[PDB]
Amino acid sequence: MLIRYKKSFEKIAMGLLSFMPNEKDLKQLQQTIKDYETDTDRQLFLWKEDEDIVGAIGVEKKDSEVEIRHISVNPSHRHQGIGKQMMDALKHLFKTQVLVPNELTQSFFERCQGQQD
Numbered sequence: 001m002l003i004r005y006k007k008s009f010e011k012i013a014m015g016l017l018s019f020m021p022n023e024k025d026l027k028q029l030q031q032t033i034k035d036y037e038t039d040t041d042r043q044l045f046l047w048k049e050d051e052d053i054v055g056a057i058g059v060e061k062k063d064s065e066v067e068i069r070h071i072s073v074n075p076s077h078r079h080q081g082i083g084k085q086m087m088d089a090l091k092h093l094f095k096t097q098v099l100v101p102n103e104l105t106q107s108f109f110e111r112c113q114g115q116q117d
């Protein structure tokens, strides 16, 4: 299930975001979360599997498009389709807009975009 980010989950959200190649230290991560909390165009979501929070997906709303800026799955919960599940849910949630990657999420985005349903 795709849930909205909440401050209760700041620790785990920072845990998951750290697996992104552009997030290399605690200060960078703290700034990213602050940016998600305070910029209205930037929205962070988390993925729940039963109780455990194991995925994070972060976007920027940009008129007709929604740009995926961060995507991460807890290493232990990878290779189970969660990463795609998250993007698919986000496509459903932002159905009025065009979902697009930035340079950092392009490769996994295209991999998923190339699949059959």
Ligand SMILES: CC(C)(COP(=O)(O)OP(=O)(O)OC[C@H]1O[C@@H](n2cnc3c(N)ncnc32)[C@H](O)[C@@H]1OP(=O)(O)O)[C@@H](O)C(=O)NCCC(=O)NCCS
Pocket: 019, 020, 021, 071, 072, 073, 074, 077, 078, 079, 080, 081, 082, 083, 084, 085, 104, 105, 106, 107, 108, 109, 111
């Ligand atoms: C990308 C990521 C979110 C995928 O999570 P996942 O839950 O394993 O995704 P899915 O199960 O839907 O798909 C897994 C497949 O995606 C592909 N894939 C994984 N990482 C990829 C990447 N960086 N670029 C392109 N394709 C990728 C692989 O083919 C993989 O197949 P395998 O499981 O047989 O090796 C995860 O690897 C991750 O958290 N990476 C660290 C953060 C990151 O680099 N994000 C940017 C992605 S461009």
Ligand code: NA
Pocket: 035, 036, 037, 038, 039, 040, 041, 042, 043, 044
């Ligand atoms: Na925000």
